[PDB]
Amino acid sequence: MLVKGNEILLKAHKEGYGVGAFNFVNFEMLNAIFEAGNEENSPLFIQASEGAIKYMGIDMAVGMVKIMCERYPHIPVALHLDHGTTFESCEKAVKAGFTSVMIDASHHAFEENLELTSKVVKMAHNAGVSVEAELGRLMVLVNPKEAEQFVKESQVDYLAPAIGTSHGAFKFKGEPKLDFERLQEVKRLTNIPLVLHGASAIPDNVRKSYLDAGGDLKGSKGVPFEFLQESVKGGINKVNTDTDLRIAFIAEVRKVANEDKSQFDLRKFFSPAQLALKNVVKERMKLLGSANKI
Amino acid sequence: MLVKGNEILLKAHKEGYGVGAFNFVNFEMLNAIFEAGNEENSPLFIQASEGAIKYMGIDMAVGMVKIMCERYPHIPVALHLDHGTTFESCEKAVKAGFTSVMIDASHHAFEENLELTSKVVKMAHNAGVSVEAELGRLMVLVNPKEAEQFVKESQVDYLAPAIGTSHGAFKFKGEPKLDFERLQEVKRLTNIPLVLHGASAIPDNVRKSYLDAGGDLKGSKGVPFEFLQESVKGGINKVNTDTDLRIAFIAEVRKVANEDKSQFDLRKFFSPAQLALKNVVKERMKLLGSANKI
Ligand SMILES: [Ca+2]
Ligand SMILES: [Ca+2]
Ligand code: NA
Ligand code: NA
Ligand SMILES: [Zn+2]
Ligand SMILES: [Zn+2]
């Protein structure tokens, strides 16, 4: 059923596994994510950015998710606001029925980030909603002693510490590198669920599908599977994944468009796109250790 | 709000206009159709084929529509099962919350069509749901005296009489031709709302967009705008439209794929696709006379 974010992540935290947090912008993405969770018996975070919420309308975003939770009531699901930018945005998501919200004030100095985060936490906790915050900048790394105080004072439920990742398909020039020692220190000092942003891997098969369909991914590099596994070992419990989904999905859309110029049945485009997305999610659930955890 | 199909079509019947009945298979299509209706102050039929219902899940098809009706409560909307093939399918739709159902048994002989249609009508009317049936074969044309007896005996709410159209983008091998005298006789003998299937026009601008984006529409031909207007004059009150929507939508998808091979943001594909679909619907509402009828 639809539950507080912390209900899912506290379990992941205690048992040392990762739960994928999968972005959606419409029905096709949502359906594929839920079918993956059903097929792998995995809990999941379903998340929507502010842009996605604007696109769908927050009423439809929450509404569709509730319908899917009713279709699959045995799956623990948290509905999470990804990269909330203002107190007001977070409050709107709480009122609409989100069960987790991220307030991202990581671009502010420590004091201001702590202050805004704490304000969101008071409001969210009053409504029974879990809160994520962020420390460090994907484009300076997290300071573990800052993280310690930050969590203690804000009472935030989970923290996203910057350790080397970044959003999108172009995460690394040269060999991929993440600061796992910094990750481990943050984990020890905070003892709460941690969140990894920019965690798409861009798997070989997905890259190939996109390129075979005429796509261009020059210079793209994701987080290796091995690094994702090491992140979870290090204390990451929520793993934000968006780019892998988009690439897998759009690869199939491009392929259909290429192979039949007379094809305009939407389902012929989006059925294969859903399947590719679903498969990426299923594999990731197995990789992170959330499979068979329901 | 969401209302029985007859509420909308009895008004269209009395006042002599046509209401577009627009197929959807997902959120993007549904949203564009509703925005069109909002912007043209037009009632609308939103319809889903059995295939589309299988694709979405009937729970999501109805659920998304109810969310949209709550977002635009001033718009009269009927949710209609397009081409129901069995009593059981129609009954499932009634139980799920559809407010109109089509039972299509037009491939059977008169007696069997009447028998099945009558059975559906009894079940649907018990639940306050309006029913459409079909006479003739889109490919033999309706027999007006048959239609008269069929409507009387079945107590069906609206009838789709075969007068020369067919589904899809390839409607005519020669000059477009419809039997308007046959239409008028059916209208006169039945005095109920009538339905035009296969009513897409494939407008010049839509075709051009699709072609420009690398699509192939060799040989395609729809119902001319003038024929749609003549249909409405002749008594057509519900105008089924799907192909125009698909082509306009997919044209934009193809265009985005072509113009940027590195683009995989779903919203970059589907925002322009929604807009093109919305515009087709807005123009059609004006053409059929449902604009400014709320
Ligand atoms: Ca940030
Ligand atoms: Ca038929
Ligand atoms: Na997040
Ligand atoms: Na119909
Ligand atoms: Zn992020
Ligand atoms: Zn039809």
From Swiss-Prot, chains A, B:
> Catalyzes what?
beta-D-fructose 1,6-bisphosphate = D-glyceraldehyde 3-phosphate + dihydroxyacetone phosphate
Q: Which Gene3D superfamilies match?
A: Aldolase class I
User: Does Phosphoprotein show up as a keyword for this record?
Assistant: no
Which enzyme type, at the first EC level?
lyase
**Keyword flag rRNA-binding:** no
Against InterPro entries, the record matches this protein to:
Aldolase_TIM, Class_II_FBP_aldolase, FBA_II, Fruc_bis_ald_class-2
Q: Residues that bind D-glyceraldehyde 3-phosphate, according to the entry?
A: 49
List, separated by semicolons, the cofactors it needs.
Zn(2+)
Keywords assigned by UniProt, alphabetized: Glycolysis, Lyase, Metal-binding, Zinc
The note on the cofactor says: Binds 2 Zn(2+) ions per subunit. One is catalytic and the other provides a structural contribution.
Residues annotated for Zn(2+) 2 binding in this entry: 104, 134
GO MF annotation terms: fructose-bisphosphate aldolase activity; zinc ion binding
Biological-process GO terms, alphabetical? fructose 1,6-bisphosphate metabolic process; glycolytic process
Residue positions annotated to bind Zn(2+) 1 are 83, 167, 197
Q: List the active-site residues.
A: 82
* PROSITE patterns linked: ALDOLASE_CLASS_II_1, ALDOLASE_CLASS_II_2
- Residue positions annotated to bind dihydroxyacetone phosphate are 168, 198-200, 240-243
The record, for Pfam families, names: F_bP_aldolase
The pathway that the record names for this protein is:
Carbohydrate degradation; glycolysis; D-glyceraldehyde 3-phosphate and glycerone phosphate from D-glucose: step 4/4
Enzyme Commission numbers on file: 4.1.2.13
Summary of the function given for this chain in its UniProt record:
Catalyzes the aldol condensation of dihydroxyacetone phosphate (DHAP or glycerone-phosphate) with glyceraldehyde 3-phosphate (G3P) to form fructose 1,6-bisphosphate (FBP) in gluconeogenesis and the reverse reaction in glycolysis.
Oligomer status and interactors: Homodimer.
By sequence similarity, the record places it as follows: Belongs to the class II fructose-bisphosphate aldolase family.
The protein's name is: Fructose-bisphosphate aldolase
Source organism of the structure: Helicobacter pylori (strain ATCC 700392 / 26695)
Query: What phylogenetic lineage does the species belong to?
Result: Bacteria, Pseudomonadati, Campylobacterota, Epsilonproteobacteria, Campylobacterales
